[PDB]
Amino acid sequence: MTRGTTDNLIPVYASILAAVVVGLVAYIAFKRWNSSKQNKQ
Amino acid sequence: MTRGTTDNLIPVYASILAAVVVGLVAYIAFKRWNSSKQNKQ
């Protein structure tokens, strides 16, 4: 493979991962509380 | 790279894009209402 030395893909996958991790947690989370179901977090 | 002829990456990018967009919108959105700032939607 042929890619940049560093700081090229690091921020790429890192950022993308965050958007996915937050989107999944946030969505589901806010999607659960919507049922007014309280529980120890 | 080695992938199928078609209909292989179509659903890949589509989904990934969703999680990302949702993560940004949901996060920010829920991050704004958290301030209890009401406004005409």
Side-chain angles (χ1 to χ4, degrees), chain A residues 1 4-6 9-10 12 14-16 18 20-22 25 27 30-31 38 41:
Chain A
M1 61 271 229
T5 56
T6 31
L9 84 90
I10 273 123
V12 177
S15 283
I16 297 166
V20 134
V21 175
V22 182
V25 179
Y27 188 61
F30 285 108
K31 154 175 243 90
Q38 192 154 47
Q41 177 69 72

Side-chain angles (χ1 to χ4, degrees), chain A residues 18-41:
Chain A
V20 134
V21 175
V22 182
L24 249 139
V25 179
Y27 188 61
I28 300 151
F30 285 108
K31 154 175 243 90
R32 252 300 222 71
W33 181 270
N34 208 271
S35 292
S36 203
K37 164 59 63 172
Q38 192 154 47
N39 270 119
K40 179 170 281 177
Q41 177 69 72

Side-chain angles (χ1 to χ4, degrees), chain B:
Chain B
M1 61 271 229
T2 45
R3 296 91 60 78
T5 56
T6 31
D7 207 51
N8 35 264
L9 83 90
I10 273 122
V12 177
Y13 280 56
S15 283
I16 297 166
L17 262 301
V20 183
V21 178
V22 180
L24 252 136
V25 179
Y27 188 62
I28 299 150
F30 283 115
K31 155 175 243 89
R32 253 299 221 71
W33 182 269
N34 208 272
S35 292
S36 203
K37 165 59 63 172
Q38 192 153 47
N39 270 119
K40 180 170 281 177
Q41 176 69 72

